[PDB]
């Protein structure tokens, strides 16, 4: 359960950043 | 039109709620 | 241990809730 | 607002499929 929790934090941050970018580019 | 504007506004609002829900979840749980 | 098991179970449950919430949202709104 | 709504359906389906895969692979 070590670096996988850290790996999860990074994927979730990336997922939200992507979603925000998509929204702004559309409007 | 008219209903096209309403559906577009509804879809925008729902996506804004999706972002806010994801942000809250990330900040509280990580 | 003990609290390691509880936190692991909690994290698993939360991820299961994340999936169910996303599925519901997809099916109802698309 | 044409094919972008269709484009959104496909990204969301892909996002859920990915999340389910990640969960199953972990346990
Ligand atoms: Cl997502």
Author numbering:
A (entry chain B), D (entry chain B): 5 to 31
B (entry chain A), C (entry chain A): 2 to 31
The authors write:
In our new crystallization attempts of LL-37 in 1% DPC crystals were formed in the presence of 70% MPD. Disordered residues are observed at both termini resulting in an ordered channel core structure only comprising residues Phe6 to Asn30. Although narrow, the channel shows a continuous and charged inner cavity between the terminal pores with a constriction at the centre. The IF2 is stabilized by four hydrophilic residue pairs Lys15/Asn30 and Arg19/Asp26 (contact area 344 Å2). In analogy to IF2 also the smallest interface IF3 is formed by four salt bridges including residues Glu16/Arg23 and Arg19/Asp26 (contact area 339 Å2). In the interior of the channel-like structure a chloride ion is trapped by two Arg23 residues from adjacent monomers and further coordinated by two water molecules.
Human cathelicidin comprises the cathelin precursor domain and LL-37 as C-terminal extension. AMPs in mammals form part of the innate immune response.
